[PDB]
A paper describes a structure:
[name] are serine/threonine protein kinases that are regulated by Rho GTPases of the Cdc42 and Rac families (Knaus et al., 1995; Manser et al., 1994; Martin et al., 1995). In humans, the PAK family comprises six members, which are classified into groups I (PAK1, -2, and -3) and II ([name], -5, and -6) based on their domain architecture and regulatory properties (Bokoch, 2003; Jaffer and Chernoff, 2002; Kumar et al., 2006; Zhao and Manser, 2005). Group II [name] ([name]–6) regulate a wide variety of cellular functions, and PAK deregulation has been linked to tumor development. Comparison of five high-resolution crystal structures comprising the kinase domains of all three monophosphorylated, enzymatically active group II PAK family members revealed a number of catalytically productive and nonproductive conformers presumably representing snapshots of catalytic domain movements during catalysis.
Interestingly, [name] crystallized with two molecules in the asymmetric unit; one molecule was found in a noncatalytically productive conformation with an unoccupied active site (apo-[name]), and the other bound the purine inhibitor and was in a closed, catalytically productive conformation. In [name], the phosphorylated Ser602 forms a hydrogen bond network with Arg600, Arg567, Tyr620, and Phe589. In contrast, the N terminus of αC gains an additional turn with the rearrangement of the βC–αC loop. In the [name] purine complex, the αC N-terminal extension leads to the formation of two hydrogen bonds, between the conserved αC Arg487 and main chain residues of the glycine-rich loop residues Ser459 and Gly458, respectively, as well as the formation of a salt bridge by the carboxyl group of Glu457.
Author numbering: -6 to 0, 425 to 715
Write the structure that this text describes.
């Protein structure tokens, strides 16, 4: 009968101590040099540095711990990035505390986000299949470890300079287990959220498959369904309406329509799993990284 207070209530020093148990010890400025800022706000800053031992370029996200309003999501995120690694997930090399800052040392990807592509170009089905295959491989791995991303959208998909596709931004992720197999939290970016999450029903890894389907509609039509409406209004339609369809059915192949139909299924138990989707004929259309390069802004 001792009450331990929630992470939002503890001292800044004990928030930091919590993080100290899960980050790498020491000071990364020992092995990193030549920091150049490339992004900012609102919690911190992003820099490119050069590893002194190797000359390798890395990205370092520096976040002010006193500005973190979602302390527990950050804590949970740091553990996931530490423990899970996959070629289609932006890799965290190591994390550290420097004063009141969390330094996250990440792989440096120079190809921008998928959002820039879907808002300015028209992807072909080969290119769509390539993105889907990459994301589904990441999800295959993550879902098998009980990790739910919860925030799949074009904005969170980053590209290497040579056209490889990587899932990023695990700020909203969750980990389920045999003991706690489902989550209940209302988390995500409105237009991409699964109906069961919006209904506040217990949910698992299946929510990422719905969100993926919405991203496929982004890649087809340029925006997710109901993007012209206010987010809370869009959420009501997701929760209560039949699954969204593409604008022009006749301009999407039978195989891609079938793939989409397996993902945008309201009942989670009837929705395809990442494992099942990897065997879908649509993904036999996937190409090499070179097929993505012509889409990129440069």
């Amino acid at each position: 009968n001792l009450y331990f207070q929630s992470m939002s209530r503890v001292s800044h020093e004990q928030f930091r101590a919590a993080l100290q148990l899960v980050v790498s010890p020491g000071d990364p400025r020992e092995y990193l040099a030549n920091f150049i800022k490339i992004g900012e706000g609102s919690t911190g800053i992003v820099c490119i540095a050069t590893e002194k031992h190797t000359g390798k370029q890395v990205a370092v996200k520096k976040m002010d711990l006193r500005k973190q309003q979602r302390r527990e999501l950050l804590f949970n995120e740091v553990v996931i990035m530490r423990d899970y690694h996959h070629d289609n997930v932006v890799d965290m090399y190591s994390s550290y505390l420097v004063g009141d800052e969390l330094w996250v040392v990440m792989e440096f990807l120079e190809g921008g986000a998928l959002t820039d592509i879907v808002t300015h170009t028209r992807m072909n089905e080969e290119q769509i299949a390539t993105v889907c295959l990459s994301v589904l491989r990441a999800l295959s791995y993550l879902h098998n470890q009980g990790v739910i991303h919860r925030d799949i959208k074009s904005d969170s998909i980053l590209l290497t300079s040579d056209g490889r596709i990587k899932l990023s931004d695990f700020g909203f992720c969750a980990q389920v287990s045999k003991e706690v197999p489902k989550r209940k939290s209302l988390v995500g970016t409105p237009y991409w959220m699964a109906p069961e999450v919006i209904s506040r029903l217990p949910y698992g890894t299946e929510v990422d498959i719905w969100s993926l389907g919405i991203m496929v509609i982004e890649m087809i039509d340029g925006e997710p369904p109901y993007f012209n409406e206010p987010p809370l209004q869009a959420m009501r339609r997701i929760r209560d309406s039949l699954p969204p369809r593409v604008k022009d059915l006749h301009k999407v192949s039978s195989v891609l329509r079938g793939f989409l139909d397996l993902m945008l299924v309201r009942e989670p138990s009837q929705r395809a799993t990442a494992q099942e989707l990897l065997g879908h004929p649509f993904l036999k259309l996937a190409g090499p990284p070179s097929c993505i390069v012509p889409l990129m802004r440069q």
